[PDB]
């Protein structure tokens with residue numbers, strides 16, 4: 001929401017300059033953990049503890065790849081410990097490579113608003129901390145417009161569902177996206193019986209408004 | 210439940226507005242989880258409240274016209290009509306019991 005409720009830039013952890021080792025293939029679909037096939041695009045979201053979120057997205061037809069990571073903070077190339085301390089300023093986020101010809105940014109936004117609670121401030125579900133905050137990180141002006149309008153509409157939907165809470169979602173231009181450790185990539189596919197947050201307040205974002 | 214009406218846009222004015230008795234209109238979509246969630250509850254209500262009330266679904270993908278005419282702002286929305294005008298509204302998913310709409 002406002003950068004003041006994070007760690008201050010002067011207090012953020014210094015991090016390192018060498019990037020996290022990333023596996024070559026996605027653990028579920030065998031696609032490239034990094035490449036973006038011609039005509040495809042990236043979306044970046046934060047919806048809370050990021051295991052369940054990554055699974056939520058790689059199951060959508062049209063998503064080429066997903067990846068768990070850390071973004072929106074100050075610390076370069078953080079570790080899970082560091083992010084969990086709160087002293088990185090990052091949010092646990094997920095990086096999505098999708099084909100606009102099969103799934104559109106508007107639909108990804110619908111998924112976003114439906115599968116977490118965007119009005120919980122510095123927590124999501126039972127997980128407390130700024131690393132669990134709600135955020136949308138546009139990479140293009142078209143996404144910036146689409147995401148901000150969707151925030152408008154979904155706040156209205158919340159009011160219609162007789163919910164007086166105000167959306168705490170951050171929307172900022174995307175900064176470097178740091179991949180999480182290899183253990184977290186496709187975590188719930190490697191560990192089927194692990195933790196996936198309950199999501200959503202029970203309302204969906206109707207189309208085109 | 211073979212007691213629920215599936216609507217279309219032009220089908221709306223005839224089937225719910227100029228219709229006698231109480232009609233409950235489900236504004237649903239296949240891609241909205243809470244829609245899928247409350248649908249079986251609507252089946253059981255179509256059974257248990259027959260003769261007091263008719264429920265009727267409306268796919269907002271297959272019928273994008275009539276949902277805007279009533280200013281729905283979230284999905285799902287339940288709209289209870291009594292004689293052409295809208296009596297009650299309820300937005301969002303809700304439980305078995307929470308369907309204690311007025312009468």
Ligand code: NA
Nearest residue numbers: 049050051092
């Ligand atoms: Na976690």
